[model samples]
Target: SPQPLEQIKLSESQLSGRVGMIEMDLASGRTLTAWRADERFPMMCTFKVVLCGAVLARVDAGDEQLERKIHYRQQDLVDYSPVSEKHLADGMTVGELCAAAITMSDNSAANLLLATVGGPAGLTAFLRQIGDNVTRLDRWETELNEALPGDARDTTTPASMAATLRKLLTSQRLSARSQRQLLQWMVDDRVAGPLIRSVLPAGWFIADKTGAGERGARGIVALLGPNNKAERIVVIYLRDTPASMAERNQQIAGIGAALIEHWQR
Candidate 1:
């Protein structure tokens, strides 16, 4: 009788990790399901998502151009981040830097762009202006500072993140042209390889970003879906889970895949 896959409760612990998830169908602005969706966690590379948008907003407003080139000081070089140091020439254009920051989670590029866009305060102002309340930027020196200030490096809910994605889907914050450009960049973003991309069907057009770190981790935002299917905004996060990166990735993927499969059927 097939037992029906619809009602099957997949093993949440089978993957040896725990996650908080929230998915939204963009067509109707509806959430499929959620786990610990409202709880806040570290921003990780996912914070880059907000930063990317903030930078794009500057471009959209004609405050900055993607082709505008800026130089980095010697002290600007930092480790652990992904920006290219070997090729440190005059500088890269704003567009090039944005791509590098989001695609590779380049902390150096992010910081450089952060400073240009008015740092955390400016980023916060832009996000708020777009009605993206859940997402925020911590201090630029969080890496050097080690311990994030109470007011900085805070957290955001999965649903709230999903809402941010919704804004992108509707191009509500930026102009239609700018929104399309942002979506295109996200679709091409080269960050997390396994978390979101592994579960999606081949050729499925998914535009998203992932956030992860020790103790606190989260993957939020949207999935464009395939075959022109209804676009789904997928948000998943975890905190204090004693799970390795591999374990957590599979867990998050499984949950996201289930939602997509269910909706497809």
Candidate 2:
């Protein structure tokens, strides 16, 4: 079997697009593997993770409350809000909105939370506050997923995204309760989590958020390890490929498999 990095490069060659990836050691803050790690790729729905992080930060600061209910009109939703759309009459709690956004990548839910934390510019400022200078959000849900070729709008480098995730989850910037809630939300992801879990060997656990957009763009940022103990973070992004969504998911799953089979090297 090809090594993980080799496999990722081979996938790029086969898919006729650029692939960016980084595997980080959780304990040591070291990069175990990298490919075009500093290069920018579309954030797509993956930005929802950082969006939720900002919400948690606000909660930690006593500026927001998880139990607070946010009521919005049906017209308030943009698109693809499975949970939030159903709650138009009574509205949903901040915590429920976060769960839907992170786990399902619900577009309307993300936008609502984005508004709560000050929208795209506000979220970007929060990234700056947390020492992440390279990741930025430029637009709202569906618009941001345009994923136009070579456009830097709504983009983030794999390295920057991974580093920022490490800080949010492990750097003590948020309270323990907030961190745990964030991780649990990721653990509940129903999108790419299934794809990765399907290809991985038994007993490996994953907490991830996935993004897919126009122009064949797709990505996943995750914390993965065996037997329910997370030990590393894996970030992968695909851009401008002509491949189908099925092929893209398989490509990422292949990378996860390689990481699992040869985690020690």
Candidate 3:
């Protein structure tokens, strides 16, 4: 039998940072947590999820179509992007950019989507409208090209992120088609690491987003398990971990393993 979720423990070495995690069994309404699940951390590319939602909400309002295209010049290119490397002569549509932003973690594509949704102020407003006041997107990729400023970087608590995911999955805030499209893009995301996927049972699916940053900030928000069976939503955030990246990833994998084992039992 599996141990109770609260009994799972990590050594000091395994807890290499300010870690926050929350796992919820959506079907059963059960939950588990470790560390500061409510404390905020720099969200990095995970903020892309919110940006994606903001754009999709606009689409739901009939404000824009996914096929609407946006052009990008050399000036729009940012560091660390597979999308920019494609050197698209003719810029892609909103849908294509959303796919790149989520599936590839493409920085340039994310900025374009942010612009489409009216940038930081717009994103902040959208989040607040949804009752998510804890997360904030104050700057663009251009402003965060290097180290993030203490106040300007995007931020979210683990609980806040999990709640946002719940809203996305359960609420009418986004049209059904829009929600399906976003979730499917996440399920098909190829750029994220295997931290959550590596520990799941065969045939289980995950729709997730990942982000990493300097000072060992790494995090993932995931929806796991198969349809027509038990399902869970998990959010984990690690900040300023002193361990090597490999070690941190291993720790995250272990956490996932424990959660799956606990729920599947």
Better of 1 and 2 by lDDT: 2
- Best candidate per TM-score, number? 2
Please provide TM-scores, in order, for all candidate models, with all chains considered together: 0.83, 0.97, 0.88
Candidate lDDT scores, in order, read 0.65, 0.91, 0.75
Q: Score residue 57 of candidate 1 by CA lDDT.
A: 80
Residue 235 of candidate 3: its Cα lDDT? Answer: 80
Instruction: State how far residue 138 of model 1 sits from its true place (Å).
Output: 2.5
> Residue 121's C-alpha lDDT in candidate 3?
86
Rank the candidate models, highest lDDT first.
Answer: 2, 3, 1
Candidate 2 per-residue lDDT, tens place, 21-67, comes to 99998777799999999999999988988999999999999999999
Clashes of 1: 1
Summing lDDT over every window of 10 consecutive residues in candidate 1, give the lowest-scoring window.
1-10
Expressed as tens digits, the lDDT of each residue in 1-265 for candidate 3 is: 2253342246224564567788876555356554576777778777888889888999999998999988888778887778755756878899988988888888899998998888888998998999997988888874542224345357888778878877766677999998888788888778653534565667776788887876777878888776534277778877776678787777666777766666644
Give the TM-score (vs. native) of candidate 1: 0.83
Please provide, for model 1 over 1-265, each residue's C-alpha lDDT reduced to its tens digit, 9 standing for 90 to 100.
Answer: 1111221134234533345566677777787676667756566667667777777788877888888988877588665455646447778888877777777767788788889878887877777887867766657734522323233354567777777767765756777877777677677777764445665677566777766665534454557577855377777665565667776666565565666566553
Model 1: residues with Cα > 4 Å off, grouped in runs: 1-18, 141-152, 193-199, 216-220, 228-230
